[PDB]
Symmetry: C3
């Protein structure tokens, strides 16, 4: 239907840098991934590191699209795999009527994502 763009976001993630940083106590990483997921992903050459990085890139792209938007709580945004966005608590309510498009990708050393927010 008739829609307007509300926000845009792009994010790049070095997978090797991600693997080094992900397993740290008390971080936003720790609030986002389980201890087991983070240990696994701690091995930069793993498939687990590859995917977790892409999920993190997507979440970041979505945050950028929103933060630059007229809506202004990171544990309220979850990205599941195609990439799906699930929202909770406060933000869920903010964007109840906003359509979220996200796409992710990974190649060798790098993961990337783009997010576009849309509303009538």
């Amino acid at each position: 239907g008739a829609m307007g763009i509300v926000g845009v976001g792009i994010d790049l993630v070095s997978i090797p840098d991600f693997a080094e940083q992900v397993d740290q106590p008390g971080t936003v990483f720790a609030e986002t991934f389980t201890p087991g997921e983070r240990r696994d992903a701690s091995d930069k050459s793993s498939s687990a590191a590859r995917h977790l990085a892409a999920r993190w890139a997507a979440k970041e792209a979505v945050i950028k699209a929103w933060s630059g938007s007229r809506f202004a709580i990171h544990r309220d945004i979850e990205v599941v795999t195609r990439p799906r966005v699930r929202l909770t608590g406060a933000i869920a309510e903010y964007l109840a009527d906003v359509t979220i498009h996200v796409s992710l990708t990974h190649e060798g050393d790098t993961a990337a994502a783009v997010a576009i927010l849309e509303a009538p």
Copy 2:
């Protein structure tokens, strides 16, 4: 005019990895690029490898935008260079009334593309 977004896609392509893989018989590569194009591109430091990778990234971004869309045959989608999309057979008909925006880029080791599908 008044439009809604139908799908989004992003894709990253390691050019060196592309050059190694592209020249393989019986692959989707073989259905997409001519034997000559694929041999040329087999040299990772070439300009031919650079461009073929960007064309492949674009095609992939477009596929992602569509696959995640309400439309659900890869030799029916062709990308020509600015990036242009030409469709044939089945998919041509599916997206007869869908507007396709694609953009590509290459820098050193990496090619990238984004695609956005749009419809009233």
Copy 3:
């Protein structure tokens, strides 16, 4: 409101390659960044190189979105940091009624940006 997409652009920038090239007299770089900014950014491991590259990637993404558009003077487009677009002279007038969405990112060796042009 009801909007249609007018153009799309993506751009990738090797930061090390940027640092080598940026400080060159009489170039588009020289028309875009001050001598001081360009000398600073000449050090590839600097934070100044990181940000200038991201600004350059954004400007390029915006140029791509426009060049592929029905509007057809690079010192008329400026990108300021979130990324903001400021236009002058000719192009300012062209896009007076066009909405510009831009997003940028940097990770290690690479900067990236995407731009989307929109109009009723």
